Amino acid sequence: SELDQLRQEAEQLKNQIRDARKACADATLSQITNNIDPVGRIQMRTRRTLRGHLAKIYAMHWGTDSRLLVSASQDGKLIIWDSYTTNKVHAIPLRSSWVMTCAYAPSGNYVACGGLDNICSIYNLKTREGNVRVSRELAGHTGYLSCCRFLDDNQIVTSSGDTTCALWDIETGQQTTTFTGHTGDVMSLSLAPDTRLFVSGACDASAKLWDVREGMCRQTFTGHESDINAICFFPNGNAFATGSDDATCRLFDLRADQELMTYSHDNIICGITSVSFSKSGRLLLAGYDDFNCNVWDALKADRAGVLAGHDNRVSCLGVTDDGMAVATGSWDSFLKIWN
Amino acid sequence: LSAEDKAAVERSKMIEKQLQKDKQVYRATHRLLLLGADNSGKSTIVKQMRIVKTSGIFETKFQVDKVNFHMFDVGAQRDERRKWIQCFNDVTAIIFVVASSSYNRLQEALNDFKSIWNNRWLRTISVILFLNKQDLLAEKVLAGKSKIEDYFPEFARYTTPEDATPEPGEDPRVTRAKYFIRDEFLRISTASGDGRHYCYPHFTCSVDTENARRVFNDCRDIIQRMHLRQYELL
């Protein structure tokens, strides 16, 4: 019929993009980085061990003050910890215990949580009555929520398991904009420092760079061999690192529109659950399924240290805004702080 | 300090008191992951009933012999389950409901059980198998609708097991068919999983009221086996 030529013209466009990328790749990042100083061996020890969660932890998020952190486990509790003194600050019971993500508002007045219930619950923390109460319940996603990030106190952005992302309006409770184009479950999203465009990695070996204002996909990046589990922006906002289940990490650059460096090793065969950069964009921390999270020197593509302690796979890994500590939450109901 | 820091310490202590009060409740209630197919009949199983936003809701709570069970019936996500199923690897058991009357889709069901059984995350989770719709299968195979060899040729040489227990005054053919279907699932179960997890097969209908009792008995067996494994006895 007439639809047969659609696929062939699409694959000429794909070949054109591929050859343009190949032409624009005159050299490699490894060639430029032959004569740079290696970071060396980074040995970090656990400074604190936050105990009190009953089940496996899936997500955590630091505060903008880099002192208070929210953690979400399968026992049905969202626990807000004071990391400096190990003291607990809040313990919010959740309606649905199957929570896969959590977020902490930049202003600190709100938190968010979502999971298999397909509802993003937004909780107020600075209420007059003192006791925390649910402030909003955003619904409209036909798949499970996998990640959510606060743009500000009024609007949030979430990614669901129905190959969609959504930018909401908390005051009203309606999807302000929707982002479509992925062919698989959108596992993770990362917001740029300017909060003008965010990236989303899905279960099709694809990470898409969107536009919160335009509402249309700006760029698409493939190259991974399997589904991508976690992504994060580079500190400057011009690049992002994607960790997938094919036991490798990849650094994508928006301007170059293609991969720069790949982090992989023969011994590691397990996938990457979480990934986050350091404060200077020189030390990449990635969590694996082999019960520990290797830290990668994300400029020469080699291991520069290994964390330990966790008796199960590490599910979440966050870094403070001032770069003073790294929190790792695994499936042993323990959240360690490293410095 | 002791002016505002003491308030933080006492708050943390009240939080911790509640977190211990409810740890007991959390650990004394069993969680169950219920799943099947659209034609399996899991909806009528969910009507045990001893104790919304038009999306997501998958909650069921029941209680027997003063112990509580939380049955979860995921019925809003997409077809690809390879990602959210990881959430259910700390569950006490996985209930698998299969319709044993539609032979056309029975192969799809065997493949489903297989992928669940060999999944990396659920390689330690026991499976309670409900061969639902036995009443329909009785007339499906008793009459001349279709014969199992049209989809499963191994039924030609199959013989009924010696340990099989029929029901009084009823034709052996349906017993042969149901034990055949059972054994295909049980072959898959025993192909892998040496002693980490086991499969409990049950013959159930849409009018059975003792399904909760079966789940309770299988849960006691699973818990006792886990306790014995911790002591390295079995």
Epitope: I269, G271 | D79, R81, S115, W117
Partner: nanobody, 128 residues
Framework: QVQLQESGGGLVQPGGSLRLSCAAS????????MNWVRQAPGKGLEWVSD????????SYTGSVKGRFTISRDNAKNTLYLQMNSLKPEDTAVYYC?????????????????????RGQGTQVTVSS
């Protein structure tokens, strides 16, 4: 960018033998367990055959047991399905799938449309 391109097929008399070929590009072929599935008109996707990384573990659907054979060529990054004794009920689009997880024995791929690592299919049919 994964790409599973399949060839072969065509209208043949019942009882024939066809050698469907699957070429994989974009991933290490030897690290994944491959699969052959079929979509018949009217009904949905159904799993047919599988082959492990080395090629030792081989299982078939009972409806096509013994009649079809599967093989893997790691040197050419290719998958072969050789078909004997065709039947009118085997008229289906044949998809070549992968496994999402490498170095694993179990994965879910018999799912409906919008599965990433699956080919476009080849329409193979038998004469009356």
């Amino acid at each position: 960018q994964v790409q599973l391109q399949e060839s072969g097929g065509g209208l043949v008399q019942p009882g024939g033998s066809l050698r469907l070929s699957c070429a994989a590009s974009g991933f290490t072929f030897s690290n994944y367990k491959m699969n052959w599935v079929r979509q018949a008109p009217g009904k949905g996707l159904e799993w047919v055959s599988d082959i492990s990384q080395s090629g030792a573990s081989i299982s078939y659907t009972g409806s096509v047991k013994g009649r079809f054979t599967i093989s893997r060529d790691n040197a050419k990054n290719t998958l072969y399905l050789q078909m004997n004794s065709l039947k009118p009920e085997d008229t289906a689009v044949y998809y070549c799938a992968r496994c999402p997880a490498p170095f694993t024995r179990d994965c879910f791929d018999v799912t409906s449309t919008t599965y990433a690592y699956r080919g476009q299919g080849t329409q193979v049919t038998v004469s009356s």
